[PDB]
Design a protein around this nucleic acid. Structure first.
Length: 1536
RNA sequence: UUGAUGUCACGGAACAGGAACUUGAACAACAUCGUUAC
RNA sequence: UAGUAACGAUGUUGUUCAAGUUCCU
């Protein structure tokens, strides 16, 4: 007897949904069940398991329909069709049930009786209220009734907020799910309306259903009728296989960066030779086992698998892979909800019968990257994230637009509302409007990943970052466009004034929507405004608005967007928006860098840091542009303000801003209230192409690049020719400009910044940044009036340089050496506390210095961008891979001759650090040394005994003695009769040994004229002689010793005087003879057929190493000559090499083996024997400590890595041929013991000896790098307080030097008329330095000498000629010398030097070190072992800075400073100033008619046209072993 | 998968504070191999 | 019985980032 009507809702906006809960806290007492009553619910079948589906109840729809009906009747005076309606009833006397009352002030129309219940003919409205059910509202659910496995399958729990208004930060919050509508856009249900209801109540229900528009926080229209895990596993396996386990986080952060596109993986960088040996993109590979994969291979093959070809797949893959790697790397409260008041009765009030509706379409675009924080879980790599759509589209939620409209409305009036989440609705002026506003979401259809940014927080006590401040953040692109649609219905005749004013504000570009706005995030600007006002009061109009569901749906919206007139309605009373723009323009004079190492690691240019770059969207694609972060600029200006004002003694950079109204706490804000100034990024107005400068860290001792310390960087170029402008803006609140204290502080700070202090950018310590002029405009001279440069010009020239006093005695016929170490003192002072980079202190100085660099010897400063600068053109450029002769140019920035500031900083820092006897800034505390031990029995080889390590690597069993077995000869066969299991040293062998051979002579006492002078015939006894056979070379004999107990046969060789008794031979003659004993240590397999004498059979271990000790050469040496032609080739394998020739030919002495390869090499190989250790003594083993293992590892490392070794792999020793890395169970060892402990292990008979202590422990314990904790403590070497260190900023900045006049090259160029290019010169070999020649021995008598200052001389005339410095022979090109273009003497450069917080004596010593005495000179440039690079420096104006107004040129105080500095130096050391005497002796310059010849020695004396006793003779006599330390420390000692 | 005579949740901005920065001359001379003789 | 004496040849490149903080109020 009923009829069913089925309905269906289609959402237009992400709806919300509450959380499941068990059926016990489902009462009006749980504050979380309520406050979630107007959302959708989530039922899970099979309770206690999160598996279910969502639904919308029916009571909710009923209440919405009731409310809309109430709204509809009062709109038509209560006449439904013909009859009138009753006023309805909303009172019920019971209040135990009804977990929610009503607090809404229901409407009113045609006041009359409330139609009591005891009746029969109800009012249609009461027929709808339900006075077995007349109307039954059924549940709604999903169409197909599916089942998912949890709420996190369709939604994402996000946090919502509630901010204050005065202290505009926050309050309590609360979180609630929300589900997208592009994946669940339809529900379904039904309504069972009874038969005997009415014919108009059905119409009322139809209209009311068509009038409702929002159900669960979202607009609705109701109608009726598997790889990344294993890839990460494998990559971690690669990284742990090798020891490269510390590049893991960098790999994660760099791989995650590839999600932008899959075409970058084929563009990863390469090594410095174009090879494929990057330092992290090619880990895992090994020389052996080319089946080993590299990371680049993994990334290239997985870049194309037909499933990672779509954008979304590749992006998801990169993201999850990065997260996995990161998580692998890492392990190496007040939510107020509800309080609705349970009110008994609602205050029924009426509102009227007019209702006007206003629709405003249009769109708002972005003008600056925005930010809507939505930090989720299970993604812990970014820690400041944005809000995205399940298909990666940028959205702005409606809650944000609503909150911002509320804030702007409150700002238009001057009254903050104070609603408190409960009770009667508020009635103030700004909530009577916000109760009729409806907005909509947006999607922006951009679909591209967001960029990342890095941030820090600098500690203003040392200058570096604080312990625990470094975080990421991601910002959406700039220029994205969202659609916008706003609607308002009420009683006015259109929009109120407030809304017109606020929309005009947004139409002028001041819609500061949300985000970290303090640093210039989103600032949207509304465009293309339209509007149109409908009229719900009449009847011909309302019916149409009801016929098509208003115009909420898509087609309705499109049909309606053709009926609007353009242009917003201008207000009646404007209000002058409260944010005022200010323009900024900076101009630089140097390079500029803003670090970004991750992009550098991915980029193809192959550098280490690359400047910052941002993107901007154009609808579907981005286009990069170079910029300067806004956080950095804000920080610079803030730290400029904070170091000036005092605020009751302690400067502002020491407070904590707990509750104080500090001047900072009111312009830049704090963590208790918002700020009053907002910045913006700075675009460059140009697109300069970046450059690349190289760097290196010259060690102090043995000046030459330290290990692992080369690098580079890619800053932007800028010079006084092109000054690299910067444009920007920043907004400031209106009621700050009207103040008179704040604008004063801002003006003062910008005055400080414009004067040159506070450099913008990165490595400002070598001349980056250097702001030149900062001019702002747009504030009516309210700030731009404190920034005028005002100073004085009190002129006084600089005091002239003092006269030198250190002299040298230099003559001719003597040659000198170019190193001359400078021994240091023994006391470094470290008991002063550093100052700190806070307020400019009072008793200290701060200013600039300008100098003037003038050269007096050719100078070389190369430009290492490209080689082959001097290439003869009109020929092929180059093959892909070759070893050519590298040619360089001079340094040029924009076709201008300059000198980088780092050079000058290094030079001045070395001089100034050795003046004051300070800690070795950079130094190498590793790399234990090693020397080839000499050949002499009494000295080194007496103590090295044979041995053998046991089966367990803990003991060595010594042998007793040994003798040698000959291989490689022709007089035996030990390679064919022995197995590979004995010649390898594992199986004991039984050989025949002999110790003494015996000679024979016929006449002892008559040989005294010819023989009997060698004094070795002092143990002969007697001998009878026999004869049994005659030969062609010798005579057979038998002899007895004293009485016939021993009898030995042999073959005697006679001479002239022996022939006489031989003439008669009757084979039975008993001649008397004399036998002699000699030494003969040998061991054969069985016996030779020529010596059947007394041999002892022995047993022991045999070992061989192979054919080594080869004297190879390249010039057809002596022994190669006088051969018999047809030199054979190098055999393919040993055990086959036999001796050809003999070195001595008169007798058959030491043999050789001559061969030759295809190239011009000529080999020769002595060592025709191997050794055999026998008599393995038992019950005697020695323990191996770990020092022996370390030393042996080092020895093997030195053996197997040798650039000078023999090219033939067969002539090498066994340690180098097989690449052994550890001592195994049993092998060949010559150990050396002392009281049950071994000390050294050496593989061969004569090998190198390693020292134990690393080089770092051979200095004084106080000259090691003054580093460590040993605010900041006081323990710093005096040179690490002027120049910085790790964890303390320096206080001196150098600058790029520039040349003004004409170049005046060394040798003229190839084309005259163009005097901007020089001619090339060729240089010598210039090999690396050998720290083992100044530390000859290893025991304890040798310490580390000084700092290796090169001397001044004129040896460049020879190189300009073209001959070698030592010899006079010509020098030819090869891939080991360079060809550079150089300058000459007599050019002038000019640079600047800034400082700050200097004492009065630190400046004294610094200005001593900048300009020296009148006869000395500095030294910088390439190849200064020859004569190249000799500069002296003069100091011009020294203008100080007394206060931010004036500058007070201080030329006229230098002698005061110099005296004070020298007085301090004298205070440190009383009369122990020898090192300064030496240092002055070394910087002396040959002034005139003094041409001291210096050069490096040669190897031997027989390869120089002059014969000056090269190195091989200096090793004894003058520089023997003890006089090196002395004859090298003396400043000038002739090399003789 | 609710309950009926009473739901302003379009009733609540995930907001407020933070300098990818500190230190570092693109440079440079003597080593590398083992045994042979008595 | 029971180890002593020290000679011969002249050729050749290397490092290409390291040490720090990596999130909190």
């Amino acid at each position: 007897m009923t009829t069913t009507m089925k309905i269906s809702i289609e959402f237009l906006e992400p709806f919300r949904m509450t959380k499941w809960q068990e059926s016990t806290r489902r009462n009006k007492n749980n504050k979380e069940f309520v406050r979630g009553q107007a959302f959708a619910r989530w039922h899970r079948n099979k309770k206690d398991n999160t598996k279910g589906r969502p639904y919308i109840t029916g009571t909710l729809l009923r209440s919405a329909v009731i409310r809309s009906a109430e709204n509809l009747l009062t709109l038509s005076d209560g006449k439904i069709s013909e009859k009138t309606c009753c006023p309805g009833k909303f009172d019920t006397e019971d209040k135990d049930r009804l977990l929610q009352l009503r607090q809404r002030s229901t409407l009113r129309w045609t006041d009359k009786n409330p139609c009591p219940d005891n009746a029969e003919t109800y009012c249609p409205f009461c027929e709808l209220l339900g006075r077995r059910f007349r109307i039954h509202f059924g549940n709604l659910s999903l169409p197909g009734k599916p089942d998912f496995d949890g709420p996190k399958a369709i939604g994402s729990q996000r946090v919502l907020n509630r901010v204050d208004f005065k202290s505009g930060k926050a309050h309590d919050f609360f979180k609630a799910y929300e589900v997208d509508h592009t994946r669940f856009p339809r529900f379904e249900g039904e309504i069972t309306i009874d038969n005997k209801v009415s014919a108009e109540a059905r119409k009322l229900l139809c209209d009311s259903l068509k009038f409702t528009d929002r159900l669960c926080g979202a607009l609705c229209v109701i109608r009726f009728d598997n790889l990344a895990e294993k890839t990460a596993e494998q990559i971690i396996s690669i990284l742990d296989d090798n020891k490269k386990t510390e590049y893991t986080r960098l790999l994660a952060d760099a791989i995650r960066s590839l999600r932008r596109s899959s075409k970058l993986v084929a563009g990863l960088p390469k090594d410095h030779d174009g090879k494929d040996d990057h330092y992290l993109w090619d880990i895992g590979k090994k020389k052996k086992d080319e089946n080993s994969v590299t990371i680049r291979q993994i990334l290239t093959t997985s870049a194309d698998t037909k499933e990672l070809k779509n954008a979304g797949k590749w992006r998801e893959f990169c993201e999850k892979l990065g997260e996995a790697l990161y998580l692998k790397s890492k392990d190496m409260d007040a939510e107020f909800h509800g309080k609705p008041d349970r009110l008994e009765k609602s205050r029924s009030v009426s509102i009227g019968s007019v209702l006007k509706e206003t629709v405003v379409c249009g769109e708002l675009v972005a003008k600056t990257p925005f930010f809507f924080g939505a930090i989720d879980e299970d993604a812990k790599q970014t820690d400041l994230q944005v809000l995205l759509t399940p298909d990666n589209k940028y959205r702005l939620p409606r809650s944000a637009v609503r909150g911002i409209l509320r804030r702007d409305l409150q700002t238009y009036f001057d009254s903050p509302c104070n609603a408190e989440l409960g009770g009667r609705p508020c009635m103030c002026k700004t909530c009577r409007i916000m109760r009729g506003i409806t907005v909509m979401d947006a999607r922006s259809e951009y679909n591209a990943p967001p960029e990342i940014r890095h941030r820090t927080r600098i500690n203003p006590f040392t200058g570096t970052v604080a312990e625990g401040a470094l975080f990421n953040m991601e910002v959406a692109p700039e220029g994205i466009v969202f659609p916008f649609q706003l609607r308002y219905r009420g009683s006015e005749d259109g929009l109120p004034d407030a809304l017109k004013t606020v929309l005009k504000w947004w139409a002028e570009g001041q819609a500061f929507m949300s985000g970290a706005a303090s640093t210039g995030k989103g600032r949207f600007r509304m465009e293309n405004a339209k509007y149109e006002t409908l009229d719900l009061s009449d009847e011909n109009q309302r019916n149409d608005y009801l016929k098509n569901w208003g115009w909420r749906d898509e087609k309705g919206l499109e049909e309606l967007k053709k009926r609007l007139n353009s242009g917003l309605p201008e207000p009646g009373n404007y209000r002058d928006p409260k944010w005022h723009e200010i323009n900024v323009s900076i101009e630089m004079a140097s390079p500029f860098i803003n670090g970004d190492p991750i992009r550098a690691a991915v980029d193809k240019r192959g550098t280490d840091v690359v400047t910052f770059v941002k993107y901007k969207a154009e609808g579907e694609e981005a286009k990069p542009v170079c910029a300067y972060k806004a956080e950095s600029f804000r920080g610079v200006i803030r730290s400029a303000v904070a170091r000036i004002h005092m605020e009751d003694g302690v400067p502002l950079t020491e407070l904590t801003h707990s509750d104080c109204e500090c001047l900072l706490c009111q312009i830049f804000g704090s963590e208790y209230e918002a700020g009053k100034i907002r910045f913006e990024d700075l675009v460059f107005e140009s697109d300069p192409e970046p450059v690349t400068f190289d760097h290196v860290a010259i060690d102090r001792f043995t000046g030459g690049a330290a290990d692992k310390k080369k690098f580079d960087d890619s800053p932007l170029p800028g010079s006084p020719a092109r000054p690299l402008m910067l444009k920007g803006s920043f907004w400031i609140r209106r009621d700050v400009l009207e103040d008179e204290e704040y604008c004063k502080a801002l003006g003062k700070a910008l005055a400080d910044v414009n004067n040159g202090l506070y450099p913008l950018g990165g490595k400002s310590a070598i001349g980056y940044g250097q702001v030149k002029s900062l001019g702002i405009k747009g504030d009516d001279k309210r700030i731009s009036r404190l920034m005028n440069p005002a100073f004085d010009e009190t002129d006084v020239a600089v005091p002239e340089k003092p006269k030198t006093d250190a002299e040298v005695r230099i003559e001719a016929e003597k040659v000198y050496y170019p190193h001359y170490f400078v021994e240091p003192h023994k006391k470094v002072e470290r008991e002063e506390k550093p100052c700190g980079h806070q307020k400019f202190h009072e008793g200290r100085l701060t200013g600039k210095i300008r100098c003037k660099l003038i050269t007096k010897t050719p100078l070389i400063v190369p430009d290492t961008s490209n080689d082959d600068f001097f290439r003869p053109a009109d020929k092929e450029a180059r093959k892909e891979k070759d070893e050519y002769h590298k040619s360089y140019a001079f340094f040029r920035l924009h076709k201008q001759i300059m000198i980088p500031g780092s050079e000058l900083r290094g030079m001045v820092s070395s001089v100034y650090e050795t003046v004051t006897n300070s800690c070795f800034r950079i130094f190498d505390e590793t790399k234990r040394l090693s020397w080839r031990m000499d050949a002499d029995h009494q000295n080194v080889l007496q103590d090295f005994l044979p041995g053998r390590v046991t089966a367990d690597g803990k003991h060595i069993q010594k042998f007793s003695e040994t003798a040698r077995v000959p291989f490689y000869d022709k007089t035996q066969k030990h390679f064919d009769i022995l197995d590979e299991q004995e010649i390898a040293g594992e199986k004991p062998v039984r050989m025949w040994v002999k110790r003494f051979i015996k000679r024979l002579s016929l006449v002892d006492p008559a040989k005294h004229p010819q023989k009997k002078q060698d004094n070795k015939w002092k143990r002969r006894k007697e001998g009878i002689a026999t004869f049994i056979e005659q030969k062609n070379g010798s005579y057979y004999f038998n002899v007895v010793t004293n009485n016939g107990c021993t009898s030995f046969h042999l073959w005697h060789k006679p001479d002239n005087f022996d022939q006489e008794k031989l003439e008669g031979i009757q084979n039975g003659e008993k001649l008397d003879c004399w036998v002699r004993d000699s030494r003969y240590q040998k061991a054969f397999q069985e016996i030779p057929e020529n010596d059947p004498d007394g041999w002892e059979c022995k047993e022991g271990y045999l070992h061989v190493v192979g054919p080594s000790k080869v004297e190879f050469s390249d010039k057809k040496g002596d022994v190669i000559n006088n051969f018999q032609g047809t030199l054979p080739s190098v055999p393919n394998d040993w055990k086959t090499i036999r001796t050809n020739d003999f070195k001595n030919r008169k007798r058959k002495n030491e043999p050789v083996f001559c061969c030759e390869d295809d190239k011009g090499n000529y080999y020769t190989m002595a060592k025709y024997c191997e050794t055999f250790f026998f008599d393995l003594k038992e019950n005697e083993e020695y323990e191996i400590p770990e020092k022996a293992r370390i030393k042996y590892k080092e020895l093997l490392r030195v053996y197997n890595n040798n650039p000078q070794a023999v090219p033939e792999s067969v002539f090498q020793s066994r340690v180098a041929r097989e690449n052994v890395e550890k001592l195994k169970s049993g092998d060949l060892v010559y150990f050396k013991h002392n009281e049950k402990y071994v000390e050294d292990i050496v593989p061969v008979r004569i090998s190198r000896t390693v020292d134990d202590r690393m080089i770092g422990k051979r200095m004084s314990a106080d000259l090691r790098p003054c580093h460590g904790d040993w605010r900041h403590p006081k323990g710093l070497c005096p040179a690490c307080r002027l120049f910085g260190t790790g964890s303390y900023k320096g206080r001196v900045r150098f600058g790029f030097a520039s040349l003004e006049n004409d170049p005046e090259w060394l040798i003229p160029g190839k084309n005259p008329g163009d005097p901007f290019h020089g001619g090339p010169v060729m240089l010598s070999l210039l090999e690396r330095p050998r720290p083992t020649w100044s530390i000859p021995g290893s025991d304890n008598k040798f310490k580390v000498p000084g700092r290796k200052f090169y001397v001044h001389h004129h040896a460049w005339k020879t190189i300009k000629d073209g001959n070698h410095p030592t010899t006079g022979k010509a020098i030819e090109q090869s891939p080991n010398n360079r060809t550079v273009e150089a300058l000459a003497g007599g050019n002038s450069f000019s640079f600047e030097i800034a400082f700050e917080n200097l004492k009065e004596w630190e400046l004294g010593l610094l200005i001593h070190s900048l300009q020296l005495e009148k006869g000395l000179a500095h030294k910088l440039g390439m190849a200064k072992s020859m004569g190249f690079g000799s500069v002296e420096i003069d100091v011009e104006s020294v203008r100080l800075r007394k206060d931010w107004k004036q500058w007070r040129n201080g030329n006229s105080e230098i002698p005061n400073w110099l005296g004070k500095g020298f007085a301090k130096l004298k205070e440190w050391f009383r009369d122990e100033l020898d090192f300064i005497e030496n240092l002055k002796k070394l910087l002396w310059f040959p002034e005139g008619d003094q041409a001291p010849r210096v050069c490096y020695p040669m190897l031997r004396k027989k390869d120089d046209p002059n014969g000056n006793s090269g190195y091989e003779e200096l090793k004894d006599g003058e520089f023997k072993k003890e006089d090196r330390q002395k004859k090298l420390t003396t400043p000038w000692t002739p090399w003789a």
